[PDB]
Design an enzyme around this catalytic site. Structure first.
Site, PDB file in Angstrom:
ATOM      1  CG  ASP A  60      53.125  38.079  10.950  1.00 47.44           C
ATOM      2  OD1 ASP A  60      53.999  38.661  10.254  1.00 47.44           O
ATOM      3  OD2 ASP A  60      52.700  36.858  10.777  1.00 47.44           O
ATOM      4  NE  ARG A 101      61.248  38.437  11.647  1.00 50.21           N
ATOM      5  CZ  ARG A 101      60.352  37.607  11.181  1.00 50.21           C
ATOM      6  NH1 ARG A 101      59.549  38.000  10.200  1.00 50.21           N
ATOM      7  NH2 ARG A 101      60.214  36.398  11.762  1.00 50.21           N
ATOM      8  CD  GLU A 159      54.055  35.588   5.088  1.00 48.98           C
ATOM      9  OE1 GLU A 159      54.387  36.697   4.705  1.00 48.98           O
ATOM     10  OE2 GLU A 159      54.480  35.227   6.056  1.00 48.98           O
ATOM     11  NE  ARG A 198      56.353  36.689  12.305  1.00 46.40           N
ATOM     12  CZ  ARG A 198      55.325  36.026  12.857  1.00 46.40           C
ATOM     13  NH1 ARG A 198      54.657  36.508  13.912  1.00 46.40           N
ATOM     14  NH2 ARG A 198      54.914  34.909  12.289  1.00 46.40           N
ATOM     15  CG  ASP A 207      51.888  32.361  10.609  1.00 48.34           C
ATOM     16  OD1 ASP A 207      52.720  33.160  10.221  1.00 48.34           O
ATOM     17  OD2 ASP A 207      51.577  31.399   9.980  1.00 48.34           O
ATOM     18  CB  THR A 208      49.090  37.529   9.602  1.00 55.22           C
ATOM     19  OG1 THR A 208      50.362  38.081   9.319  1.00 55.22           O
ATOM     20  CG2 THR A 208      48.563  38.229  10.862  1.00 55.22           C
TER      21      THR A 208
HETATM   22  C1  LIG Z   1      57.159  34.592  15.900  1.00 54.37           C
HETATM   23  C2  LIG Z   1      58.568  34.046  15.808  1.00 54.37           C
HETATM   24  C3  LIG Z   1      59.116  33.679  14.566  1.00 54.37           C
HETATM   25  N1  LIG Z   1      60.384  33.234  14.514  1.00 54.37           N
HETATM   26  C4  LIG Z   1      60.995  32.756  13.273  1.00 54.37           C
HETATM   27  C5  LIG Z   1      60.567  31.288  13.092  1.00 54.37           C
HETATM   28  C6  LIG Z   1      60.387  31.171  11.621  1.00 54.37           C
HETATM   29  O1  LIG Z   1      61.604  30.676  11.034  1.00 54.37           O
HETATM   30  P1  LIG Z   1      61.707  30.423   9.414  1.00 54.37           P
HETATM   31  O2  LIG Z   1      61.868  31.730   8.646  1.00 54.37           O
HETATM   32  O3  LIG Z   1      62.928  29.630   9.397  1.00 54.37           O
HETATM   33  O4  LIG Z   1      60.479  29.723   8.986  1.00 54.37           O
HETATM   34  C7  LIG Z   1      60.058  32.582  11.150  1.00 54.37           C
HETATM   35  C8  LIG Z   1      58.604  32.848  10.913  1.00 54.37           C
HETATM   36  O5  LIG Z   1      58.405  34.208  10.687  1.00 54.37           O
HETATM   37  P2  LIG Z   1      57.379  34.683   9.556  1.00 54.37           P
HETATM   38  O6  LIG Z   1      56.044  34.072   9.960  1.00 54.37           O
HETATM   39  O7  LIG Z   1      57.416  36.183   9.559  1.00 54.37           O
HETATM   40  O8  LIG Z   1      57.873  34.173   8.292  1.00 54.37           O
HETATM   41  O9  LIG Z   1      60.422  33.431  12.189  1.00 54.37           O
HETATM   42  C9  LIG Z   1      61.109  33.048  15.729  1.00 54.37           C
HETATM   43  O10 LIG Z   1      62.278  32.570  15.673  1.00 54.37           O
HETATM   44  N2  LIG Z   1      60.603  33.419  16.951  1.00 54.37           N
HETATM   45  C10 LIG Z   1      59.350  33.890  17.034  1.00 54.37           C
HETATM   46  O11 LIG Z   1      58.847  34.187  18.134  1.00 54.37           O
HETATM   47 CA   LIG Z   2      53.401  35.332   8.560  1.00 53.98          CA
END
Ligand SMILES: Cc1cn([C@H]2C[C@H](OP(=O)(O)O)[C@@H](COP(=O)(O)O)O2)c(=O)[nH]c1=O
Ligand SMILES: [Ca+2]
EC number: 3.1.31.1
Length: 129
Positions: free
Chosen positions: A15, A75, A37, A29, A34-35
């Protein structure tokens, strides 16, 4: 929403992907998904699927939604298309991603992806197996 050009720099995982967009390297991103890890069950399969889809594509495009275009980590947040096929949707449809992180004002394709998830779950694919 509008599709804009970009070029693959490097697959990262299920993702996230590094693309050149407006001539600058950016980590993207994928919105609404959500994929697992790489570490996790179906993580490697999700990564492989994204990678193959992007690497085999003649044309990558990015499509921003109506709201924020970058997250807290810098991202880019977009829907990514490979030869006109949405990577975000494709992962969900194959049971390799869950619909997740649906924030108001960047959720244009929520119902499309939820439908894909329902079909994956019906077929008991991958994550739903
Ligand atoms: C998909 C997405 C993730 N994020 C943030 C929320 C999550 O915060 P936290 O890192 O604090 O958990 C994190 C999840 O991404 P990942 O799934 O790549 O880890 O990315 C956003 O802010 N907006 C979005 O649209
Ligand atoms: Ca992920």
């Amino acid at each position: 929403l509008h599709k804009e050009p970009a070029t693959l720099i490097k697959a990262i995982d299920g993702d996230t992907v590094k693309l050149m967009y407006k001539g600058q390297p950016m980590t993207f991103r994928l919105l609404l998904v959500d994929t697992p890890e790489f570490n996790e069950k179906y993580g490697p399969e999700a990564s492989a699927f994204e990678k193959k889809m992007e690497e085999n594509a003649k044309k990558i495009e990015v499509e921003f939604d109506k709201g924020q275009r970058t997250d807290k980590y810098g991202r880019g947040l977009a829907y990514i298309y490979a030869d006109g096929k949405m990577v975000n949707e494709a992962l969900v449809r194959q049971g390799l991603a869950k619909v997740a992180y649906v924030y108001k004002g960047n959720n244009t394709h929520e119902q499309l992806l939820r439908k894909a998830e329902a079909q994956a779950k019906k077929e008991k694919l991958n994550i739903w197996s």
